[PDB]
């Protein structure tokens, strides 16, 4: 008995069904927890090829002909990689190296967003800083974002202090080494009584070499401070030892000292 | 006469406590002077502990320096001297000390008070 037959219409294919995984490297890295990358059509033999190239990210079927898509679950970058650069957000990882671009065969690994507006990267960057390691750019930078910490819950909060105290501990042994000159400055720039007390407490510690090396305007000689009460001005105005000291290196008395020196209109001394 | 600089506060106490000296003068003005505490040790020359403007700016002894705090009370016309963690070579004889801010031959000393610190 004869059938009614009847084809269904061309296929039109949607911009999701011509998606192809190997060329969105560029797509899935920015993604964010919660989110869905569709990738397309994903053959069987192909998943263990994808989610081993992005083991941050679970692979979801999300429809009929394999339709698939990617949900970022977590970021593996490790310190070292992600703390010592304010600019990369991603690496890939192939035979031991690590690379900038991405290449067939190679792992992603990514940086959480707020990697440096947190502590997550103060262990790390207490020890690089520190030595030979030094970064000028990178560890003043850091040090100075923290004390705008965008991280303003208790705990970013709680993590500032911490650090405040490590480097108080280290800072106090020697205020000379570029990443305690850097602390020393930006306590200065925050204007704020507890960092006025904690740059006191610091230059108070240190040796007697270093004060006699870089503290001469806070400790003056007896034949400087005897001269100096035949003035009416602060002797901060006129020492010579304070006009040629490091500003980081003065104590909150003297360093107010020296803003109280009356600039006649123009260049006053 | 009558520019009277009288020192008080002074005593004995063990190394480690506090004192806290007055100086109320009297025929000068702090907005016109710079007061100064000085001391003197037995068989020793005077010197400088610490110091205040006529606008209020300090300074101090390196070896006091963090120890002690000088403060002025303009309503008072009285000048302090805040002491912290006397250790023994801080005994001498305190004394005040007005120098005017541009007339240097107007310079006054006052009369001392004893501060001894021992076991």
């Known amino acids: 008995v004869e059938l009614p037959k009847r084809d269904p219409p061309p296929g039109v294919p949607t911009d999701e069904m011509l998606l192809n995984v190997d060329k969105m490297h560029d797509v899935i890295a920015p993604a964010k927890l919660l989110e869905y990358v569709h990738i397309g059509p994903l053959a069987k033999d192909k998943e263990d090829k994808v989610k081993k190239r992005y083991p941050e990210f679970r692979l979801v079927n999300t429809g009929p002909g394999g339709l698939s898509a990617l949900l970022r679950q977590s970021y593996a970058g490790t310190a070292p990689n992600c703390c010592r650069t304010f600019q990369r957000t991603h690496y890939w990882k192939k035979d031991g190296k690590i690379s900038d671009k991405y290449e067939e065969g190679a792992v992603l690994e990514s940086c959480w967003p707020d990697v440096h507006d947190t502590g997550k990267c103060d262990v790390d960057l207490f020890d690089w800083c520190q030595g030979d390691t030094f970064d000028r750019n990178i560890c003043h930078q850091w040090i100075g974002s923290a004390f705008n910490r965008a991280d303003r819950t208790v705990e970013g909060q709680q993590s500032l202090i911490n650090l405040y105290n490590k480097m108080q501990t280290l800072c106090s042994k020697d205020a000379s080494v570029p990443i305690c000159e850097s602390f020393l400055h930006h306590l200065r720039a925050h204007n704020t009584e507890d960092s006025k007390e904690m740059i006191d407490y610091i230059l108070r510690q240190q040796s007697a070499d270093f004060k006699q090396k870089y503290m001469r305007c806070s400790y003056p000689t007896r034949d400087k401070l005897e001269e100096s009460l035949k003035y009416a001005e602060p002797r901060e105005c006129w020492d010579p030892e304070c006009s040629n000291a490091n500003v980081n290196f003065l104590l909150t008395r003297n360093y107010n000292n020296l803003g109280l020196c009356n600039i006649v209109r123009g260049s006053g001394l | 006469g009558e520019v009277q600089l009288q020192a008080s506060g002074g005593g004995l106490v063990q190394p480690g406590g506090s004192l806290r000296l007055s100086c109320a003068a009297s025929?000068?003005?702090?907005?016109?002077?710079?007061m100064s505490w000085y001391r003197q040790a037995p068989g020793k020359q005077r010197e400088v502990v610490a110091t205040?403007?006529?606008?209020?700016?300090?300074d101090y002894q390196d070896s006091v320096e963090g120890r002690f705090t000088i403060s002025r009370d303009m309503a008072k016309n009285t000048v302090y001297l805040q002491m912290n963690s006397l250790k023994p070579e801080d005994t001498a004889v305190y004394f005040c000390?007005?120098?005017?801010?541009?007339?240097?031959?107007?310079?006054?000393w006052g009369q001392g008070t004893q501060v001894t610190v021992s076991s």
């Open positions: 205040i403007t006529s606008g209020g700016a300090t």
């Open positions: 000390n007005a120098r005017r801010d541009n007339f240097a031959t107007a310079i006054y």
């Open positions: 025929g000068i003005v702090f907005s016109n002077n710079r």
